[PDB]
Swiss-Prot record, chain A:
Section of the entire sequence shown: 553 to 608 of 627
Disease affiliated with this protein: Neutropenia, severe congenital, 10, autosomal recessive: A form of severe congenital neutropenia, a disorder of hematopoiesis characterized by maturation arrest of granulopoiesis at the level of promyelocytes with peripheral blood absolute neutrophil counts below 0.5 x 10(9)/l, and early onset of severe bacterial infections. SCN10 is characterized by infantile onset of neutropenia. Anemia and thrombocytopenia may be transiently present.
Top-level taxonomic group: Eukaryota
The species this protein was found in: Homo sapiens (Human)
Assembly behavior: Heterodimer with SRP72. SRP68/SRP72 heterodimer formation is stabilized by the presence of 7SL RNA. Component of a signal recognition particle (SRP) complex that consists of a 7SL RNA molecule of 300 nucleotides and six protein subunits: SRP72, SRP68, SRP54, SRP19, SRP14 and SRP9. Within the SRP complex, interacts (via C-terminus) with SRP72 (via N-terminus).
Localization in the cell: Cytoplasm; Nucleus, Nucleolus; Endoplasmic reticulum
Role noted for this protein: Component of the signal recognition particle (SRP) complex, a ribonucleoprotein complex that mediates the cotranslational targeting of secretory and membrane proteins to the endoplasmic reticulum (ER). The SRP complex interacts with the signal sequence in nascent secretory and membrane proteins and directs them to the membrane of the ER. The SRP complex targets the ribosome-nascent chain complex to the SRP receptor (SR), which is anchored in the ER, where SR compaction and GTPase rearrangement drive cotranslational protein translocation into the ER.
Comment, domains: The N-terminus is required for RNA-binding.
The name this protein goes by in its record: Signal recognition particle subunit SRP68
Similarity comment: Belongs to the SRP68 family.
From Swiss-Prot, chain B:
GN (gene name): SRP72
Result, substituting residue 36 to E: Reduced interaction with SRP68
Primary residence: cytoplasm
Annotated TPR repeat ranges: 3-36, 101-134, 201-234, 381-414
Gene Ontology BP, a term: SRP-dependent cotranslational protein targeting to membrane
Cross-link (Glycyl lysine isopeptide (Lys-Gly) (interchain with G-Cter in SUMO2)): 366
Assembly and interaction partners: Heterodimer with SRP68. SRP68-SRP72 heterodimer formation is stabilized by the presence of 7SL RNA. Component of a signal recognition particle (SRP) complex that consists of a 7SL RNA molecule of 300 nucleotides and six protein subunits: SRP72, SRP68, SRP54, SRP19, SRP14 and SRP9. Within the SRP complex, interacts (via N-terminus) with SRP68 (via C-terminus).
Record's subcellular location: Cytoplasm; Endoplasmic reticulum
Protein name as it appears in the record: Signal recognition particle subunit SRP72
Outcome recorded upon mutating residue 48 to A: Loss of interaction with SRP72
Organism: Homo sapiens
Statement: the UniProt record of this protein carries the keyword Ubl conjugation: yes
Region (Required for the interaction with the SRP68/7SL RNA complex): 354-436
Associated disease: Bone marrow failure syndrome 1: An autosomal dominant disease characterized by aplastic anemia and myelodysplasia resulting from bone marrow failure. Aplastic anemia is a form of anemia in which the bone marrow fails to produce adequate numbers of peripheral blood elements. Myelodysplasia is a clonal hematopoietic stem cell disorder in which immature cells in the bone marrow become malformed and dysfunctional.
């Protein structure tokens, strides 16, 4: 498409006929990258309170 | 049995690692005595470690009358966050009397889930710089995940997990060649680790994305198919792989496209993925509905997406495509016109599409007029080439040479003596030579 060809001066006579190919019509699909690896570290912080005040 | 004996057994079993029988003896203490805040704290901790967040939430809500003192702010907030109740968890963290390290780290995770990447990045920088523990590599890779997400979607210039996240950041920044090399380094680091194949599955899923971006569609498709057949336990990764396969297939493999879509909308997907990913998924399935004659649902998805005003993906084009597919595109004319008028910042590409629609069958002069209206991209060699050939089609030589003059003047004003500048001058010179 011409949208990705905004450089140089190609004659591309297709622009004057029906198959202009100016932009992606219908619009192109949008792939997405995989989400970055994230860790739920807060599971490591849940634990019993200090029992030293209430032990034998 | 003596209460200190039960407490000693509780402490021993808690340091042992398992929690079910620890919970059983904690509730035995509870039935012994109803007013020991340590006992209910141990109970909610056991419930959280056992994965029953709803039960701990219910316990906290029922015993809020007697809790008082310091309150189970962190435990309640964690139960809400793990129950996808992020909005209530925000105020649960914010309404706590005192802020602890566990609360701050939970707040950072919640902010990451809220896509508030600025405050999340700041708080996680503070977490890494301040708190030292046995999971500092995990904090480093989480911070790297945050910066990768910000660079990938918010457009912000910045162990195998850290290498993979660095590759994700490089993908976001636009680099593709070195991303493959870094992913191969992470693949080596993973291969030497397990000798657990899901951590290699995600690496290969990111590898296939780079393969697809560079044009090597066949190898990307084979990699994606092998990752899908490997059956990883993640759900967001499956959605990402499925919609990337959607983008690869386009309008050819619709039968597999439906399968990928059904894998794209599963339980917990809306929470694992970012808002930008979900919006791109909505765009992709609206496109698929268009290519599969499903017009009403396509329009519904387009309207719902426009209601959110997406930053990067404008869905009105899809609706325009609808009105271009059903051949009554006269309404699409004014639809794109008014959308461009209401959104001047996004009007440029809308008018670029407008021109293509106005060269579809006729009215070429109006197409040139609306091409001239795109001031942002007016002085580009490709567009001026298109304008010149269109004007030469109907022999509007004066308009073509005046377009040349405006382009040359703007280039002289902004970037004199550019290679594209000199190319424009030479092309104009020979055009004038061959047309007087």
């Amino acid at each position: 498409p011409l949208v990705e060809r905004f450089e140089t001066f190609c004659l591309d006579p297709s622009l004057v006929t029906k198959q202009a190919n100016l932009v992606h019509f219908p619009p192109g699909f949008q792939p997405i990258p995989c989400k970055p690896l994230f860790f739920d570290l807060a599971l490591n912080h849940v634990a019993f309170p200090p029992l030293e005040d209430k032990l034998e | 049995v003596s209460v200190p004996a039960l407490w000693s057994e509780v402490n021993r079993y808690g340091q042992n690692g398992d929690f079910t029988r620890a919970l059983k003896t904690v509730n035995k203490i509870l039935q012994i005595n109803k007013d020991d805040v340590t006992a209910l704290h141990c109970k909610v901790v056991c419930l959280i470690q056992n994965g029953s967040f709803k039960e701990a939430l219910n316990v906290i809500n029922t015993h809020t009358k007697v809790l008082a003192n310091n309150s189970l702010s962190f435990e309640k907030a964690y139960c809400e966050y793990r129950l996808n109740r992020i909005e209530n968890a925000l105020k649960t963290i914010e309404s706590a009397n005192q802020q602890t390290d566990k609360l701050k780290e939970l707040y950072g995770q919640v902010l990451y889930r809220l896509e508030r990447y600025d405050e999340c990045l700041a708080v996680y920088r503070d977490l890494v710089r301040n708190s030292q523990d046995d999971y500092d590599e995990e904090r480093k890779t989480n911070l790297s995940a945050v910066v990768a997400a910000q660079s990938n979607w918010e457009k912000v210039v910045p162990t195998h997990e850290l290498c993979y996240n660095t590759a994700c950041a490089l993908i976001g920044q636009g680099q593709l060649n070195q991303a493959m090399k870094i992913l191969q380094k992470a693949e080596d680091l993973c291969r030497r680790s397990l000798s657990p194949q899901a951590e290699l599955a995600i690496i290969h899923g990111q590898m296939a994305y780079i393969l697809q971006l560079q044009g090597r569609t066949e190898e990307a498709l084979q990699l994606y198919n092998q990752i899908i057949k490997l059956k990883p336990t993640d759900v967001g990764l499956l959605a990402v792989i499925a919609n990337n396969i959607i983008t690869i297939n386009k309008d050819q493999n619709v039968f597999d496209s439906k399968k990928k879509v059904k894998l794209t909308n599963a339980e917990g997907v809306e929470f694992k993925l970012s808002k930008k990913q979900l919006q791109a998924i909505e765009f992709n399935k609206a496109l698929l509905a268009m290519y599969t004659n499903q017009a009403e649902q396509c329009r519904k998805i387009s309207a719902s997406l426009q209601s959110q005003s997406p930053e990067h993906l404008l869905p009105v084009l899809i609706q325009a495509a609808q009105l271009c597919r059903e051949k009554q595109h006269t309404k699409a004319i004014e639809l794109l016109q008014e959308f461009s008028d209401q959104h001047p910042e996004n009007a440029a590409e809308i008018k670029l599409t407008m021109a293509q629609l106005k060269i579809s069958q006729g009215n070429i002069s109006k197409a040139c007029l609306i091409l001239r209206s795109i001031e942002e991209l007016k002085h580009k060699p490709g567009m001026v080439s298109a304008l010149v050939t269109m004007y030469s089609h109907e022999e509007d030589i004066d308009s073509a040479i005046e377009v040349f003059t405006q382009a040359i003047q703007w280039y002289q004003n902004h970037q004199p003596k550019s290679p594209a500048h000199l190319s424009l001058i030479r092309e104009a010179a020979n055009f004038k030579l061959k047309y007087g």
